[PDB]
């Protein structure tokens, strides 16, 4: 019973799931059958949802807010949710190398935006 609705398509939609592990801001917590109401912020990690047996679908979420209801409902609202097989290893190295050289090189919000992009690209490349 999950409600992983993004801003482009619906993943879970109907209540037909068992377990789901999504990387939150505090730690890598996972929802079971009927989790408690712990609506916390989701970080840029991997949101895998185990479907009964070993039919889990690894969905690399870009970060959101994993809200849990008290009636056996888990609403994982994220901006982008793509699979791990939809990313290339050669194209991911170009964005991580450009963000490291642009950090601490100017002013305004140019140096602050490069630090957040380098941390999210390093976590997705290590989970291949």
């Amino acid at each position: 019973k999950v409600s992983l609705v993004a801003p482009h398509q619906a993943i879970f939609t109907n209540k037909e799931v068992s377990q789901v592990n999504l990387p939150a801001s505090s730690g890598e917590m996972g929802v079971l059958a009927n989790h408690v109401p712990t609506v916390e912020e989701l970080a840029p990690g991997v949101v895998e949802v185990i479907e009964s047996s070993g039919t889990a679908s690894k969905y690399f979420v870009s970060g959101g807010f994993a809200s849990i209801l008290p009636g056996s409902k888990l609403s994982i609202s994220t901006v982008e949710a793509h699979p791990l097989d939809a990313f290339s290893s050669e194209n991911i190295k170009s964005l991580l190398a450009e963000a490291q050289k642009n950090a601490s090189s100017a002013d305004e919000t140019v140096a602050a935006e490069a630090a957040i992009e380098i941390e999210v690209l390093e976590a997705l490349q290590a989970a291949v």
Partner: protein, 72 residues
Amino acid sequence: MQLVLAAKYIGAAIATIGLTGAGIGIAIVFAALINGTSRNPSLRNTLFPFAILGFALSEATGLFCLMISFLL
């Protein structure tokens, strides 16, 4: 003997001070099991095997300390 009888009563009383560690050990595992079971579902499983096995290890300090007090 007067000296042997006085040391036996003091040995059983000084050895009873170790009940604070054994009494708080069973409450420490029970506090985490009561708060952890509300998240679901670690009541009948998952944390059920850890609560039974964890309480037996913490209770070994109270049974070993009580044997030397009754034998003195």
